[PDB]
Enzyme design. Structure first.
Site, PDB file in Angstrom:
ATOM      1  CG  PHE A  78      11.508  23.467  19.109  1.00 33.63           C
ATOM      2  CD1 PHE A  78      11.404  24.265  17.896  1.00 33.63           C
ATOM      3  CD2 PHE A  78      10.408  23.195  19.761  1.00 33.63           C
ATOM      4  CE1 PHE A  78       9.976  24.876  17.588  1.00 33.63           C
ATOM      5  CE2 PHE A  78       9.024  23.721  19.490  1.00 33.63           C
ATOM      6  CZ  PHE A  78       9.091  24.455  18.172  1.00 33.63           C
TER       7      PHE A  78
ATOM      8  CB  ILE B  75      11.933  21.941  30.400  1.00 38.71           C
ATOM      9  CG1 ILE B  75      11.568  21.457  28.822  1.00 38.71           C
ATOM     10  CG2 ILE B  75      12.927  20.890  30.643  1.00 38.71           C
ATOM     11  CD1 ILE B  75      12.874  21.747  27.827  1.00 38.71           C
TER      12      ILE B  75
ATOM     13  CG  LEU C  26      17.449  26.648  21.939  1.00 39.05           C
ATOM     14  CD1 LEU C  26      16.175  27.646  21.787  1.00 39.05           C
ATOM     15  CD2 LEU C  26      18.397  26.646  21.453  1.00 39.05           C
TER      16      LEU C  26
ATOM     17  CG  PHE D 134       1.362  25.622  24.666  1.00 40.49           C
ATOM     18  CD1 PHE D 134       1.940  24.355  24.353  1.00 40.49           C
ATOM     19  CD2 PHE D 134       1.780  26.580  25.274  1.00 40.49           C
ATOM     20  CE1 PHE D 134       3.333  24.329  24.992  1.00 40.49           C
ATOM     21  CE2 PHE D 134       3.107  26.325  25.965  1.00 40.49           C
ATOM     22  CZ  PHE D 134       3.813  25.296  25.997  1.00 40.49           C
TER      23      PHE D 134
ATOM     24  CG  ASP E 152       3.882  36.295  23.915  1.00 40.03           C
ATOM     25  OD1 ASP E 152       3.799  37.397  24.629  1.00 40.03           O
ATOM     26  OD2 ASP E 152       3.661  35.328  24.246  1.00 40.03           O
TER      27      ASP E 152
ATOM     28  CE  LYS F   4       0.476  22.260  33.359  1.00 41.81           C
ATOM     29  NZ  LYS F   4       0.064  20.670  33.216  1.00 41.81           N
ATOM     30  N   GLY F   5       2.025  25.177  29.821  1.00 43.48           N
ATOM     31  CA  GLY F   5       1.278  26.476  29.113  1.00 43.48           C
ATOM     32  C   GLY F   5      -0.201  25.865  28.903  1.00 43.48           C
TER      33      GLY F   5
ATOM     34  CD  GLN G 213       2.375  18.606  30.666  1.00 45.20           C
ATOM     35  OE1 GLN G 213       2.640  17.140  30.014  1.00 45.20           O
ATOM     36  NE2 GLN G 213       2.306  18.577  31.963  1.00 45.20           N
ATOM     37  CB  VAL G 214       8.089  22.597  26.608  1.00 48.79           C
ATOM     38  CG1 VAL G 214       9.206  22.325  26.158  1.00 48.79           C
ATOM     39  CG2 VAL G 214       7.080  23.639  25.956  1.00 48.79           C
TER      40      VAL G 214
HETATM   41  C1  LIG Z   1      11.965  25.644  29.169  1.00 45.46           C
HETATM   42  C2  LIG Z   1      11.772  25.597  27.480  1.00 45.46           C
HETATM   43  O1  LIG Z   1      12.942  25.105  26.837  1.00 45.46           O
HETATM   44  C3  LIG Z   1      13.127  25.192  25.265  1.00 45.46           C
HETATM   45  C4  LIG Z   1      11.795  25.696  24.390  1.00 45.46           C
HETATM   46  C5  LIG Z   1      11.883  25.703  23.110  1.00 45.46           C
HETATM   47  C6  LIG Z   1      10.947  26.171  22.113  1.00 45.46           C
HETATM   48  C7  LIG Z   1       9.542  26.437  22.424  1.00 45.46           C
HETATM   49  S1  LIG Z   1       8.857  26.618  23.968  1.00 45.46           S
HETATM   50  C8  LIG Z   1       7.377  27.236  23.520  1.00 45.46           C
HETATM   51  S2  LIG Z   1       6.268  27.200  24.523  1.00 45.46           S
HETATM   52  N1  LIG Z   1       7.060  27.343  22.056  1.00 45.46           N
HETATM   53  C9  LIG Z   1       8.725  26.892  21.436  1.00 45.46           C
HETATM   54  O2  LIG Z   1       8.580  27.178  20.410  1.00 45.46           O
HETATM   55  C10 LIG Z   1      13.207  25.168  22.681  1.00 45.46           C
HETATM   56  C11 LIG Z   1      14.214  24.695  23.372  1.00 45.46           C
HETATM   57  C12 LIG Z   1      14.047  24.610  24.646  1.00 45.46           C
HETATM   58  O3  LIG Z   1      15.254  24.298  25.425  1.00 45.46           O
END
Ligand SMILES: CCOc1cc(/C=C2\SC(=S)NC2=O)ccc1O
Length: 343
Positions: free
Chosen positions: A105, A32, A108, A37, A154, A34-35, A39-40
């Site tokens: 986390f 979900i 969200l 740092f 940021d 990409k960075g 991935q998420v």
């Molecule tokens: C697409 C990202 O979705 C979410 C992202 C996060 C938190 C993040 S992303 C990031 S880079 N640093 C965070 O603390 C929490 C819940 C989510 O559903």
């Protein structure tokens, strides 16, 4: 060639496979985020029986170190018993998995940039903007607590997310670039569009830089377009000056990078350097917001809560958030006391 026994790519990002289960607990659904740092990913936690976002930090010392700070700050914030903390993204737990630090986390919903994109960049109502504004000021008030004294560093629409897609509750995410009040180790901070003048001028900065960002975000949310969208820093400053005028003399005299944007005349006054811009302070926020012309582009004409009186409350608050002087710029406590929020 193989990296981290084949678990990592060349960037030392964890190779994400949909459907993979970690430690008989988390089932990876999809990527979900990409960075730089890492991935998420979206994952299901079988133990808590809920969806979670997992921030997978890159398998490198530099990125791990950055995230360690992120974790301290997140855990420090979560430590406080105040109800203001709930506007900040909650870190449930963190763990090391296959040489990757992972932050778990709460899941969200859409970020505020997605909302903007969904409107085809025409913005949301003043009513929704007010709701977002109140929550953000509360968030900044919490960050401003002396024990924390955290600067997000940021703030932008992408970094603000809705809890639920059918509610207006928001949470600030990504503390990966955050720091605490202290020595200005970093000069080049914040996303450009949301970069405060003090940062641009290479001056000392406090928590007020976030407040400046908020002002830019709030205007952006209502209009759908960034207030100041500089191609470079010089363009950024020029776009700020168009709306707000030349920064006061007392600031520029103290500013190490003043001569990047301005020149000091024999009389000691400051002017923009030559090198397509409206004259200083003539791109009035009054007209950007469409205070008297039915909102931005006239799209809000006839809509409840979009009167001149309403717009003037919004404008005054924004202008207080975009004060050139970080010592006089409105603070979260006073912003919450603004007439824009009264019922
Ligand atoms: C697409 C990202 O979705 C979410 C992202 C996060 C938190 C993040 S992303 C990031 S880079 N640093 C965070 O603390 C929490 C819940 C989510 O559903």
């Amino acid at each position: 060639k193989v990296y981290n026994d084949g678990y990592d790519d060349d960037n030392y990002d964890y190779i994400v496979k949909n459907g993979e289960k970690w430690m008989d607990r988390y089932e990876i659904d999809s990527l979900i985020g990409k960075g730089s740092f890492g991935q998420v990913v979206k994952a299901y936690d079988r133990v808590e029986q809920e969806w979670v976002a997992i921030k997978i930090i890159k398998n490198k010392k530099a990125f791990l170190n950055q995230a360690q700070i992120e974790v301290r700050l997140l855990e420090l914030m979560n430590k406080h018993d105040t109800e203001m903390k709930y506007y900040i993204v909650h870190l449930k737990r963190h763990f090391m998995f296959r040489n990757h630090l992972c932050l778990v986390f709460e899941m969200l919903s859409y970020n505020l940039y997605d909302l903007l994109r969904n409107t085809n960049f025409r913005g949301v109502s003043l009513n929704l903007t007010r709701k977002f504004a109140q929550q953000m000021c509360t968030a900044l008030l919490f960050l401003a607590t002396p024990e924390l004294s955290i600067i997000h560093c940021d703030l932008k629409p992408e970094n603000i997310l809705l809890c639920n897609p059918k509610r207006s509750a928001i949470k600030i995410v990504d503390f990966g670039s955050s720091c605490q009040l202290g020595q200005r180790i970093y000069q080049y901070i914040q996303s450009r569009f949301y970069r405060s003048p003090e940062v641009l001028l290479g001056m000392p900065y406090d928590l007020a830089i976030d407040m400046w960002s908020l002002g830019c975000i709030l205007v952006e949310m209502h209009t759908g377009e960034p207030l100041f969208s500089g191609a470079n820093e010089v363009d950024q400053m020029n776009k700020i000056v168009e709306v707000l005028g030349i920064p006061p003399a007392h600031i520029l005299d103290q500013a190490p990078k003043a001569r990047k944007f301005f020149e000091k005349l024999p009389d000691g006054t400051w002017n923009l350097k030559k090198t397509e811009y409206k004259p200083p302070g003539t791109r009035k926020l009054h007209n950007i917001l469409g205070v008297e012309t039915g909102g931005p582009g006239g799209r809000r004409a006839g809509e409840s809560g979009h009167t001149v009186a309403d717009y003037l409350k919004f404008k005054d608050l924004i202008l207080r958030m975009l004060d050139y002087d970080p010592k006089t710029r409105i603070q979260p406590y006073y912003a919450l006391q603004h007439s824009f929020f009264k019922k």
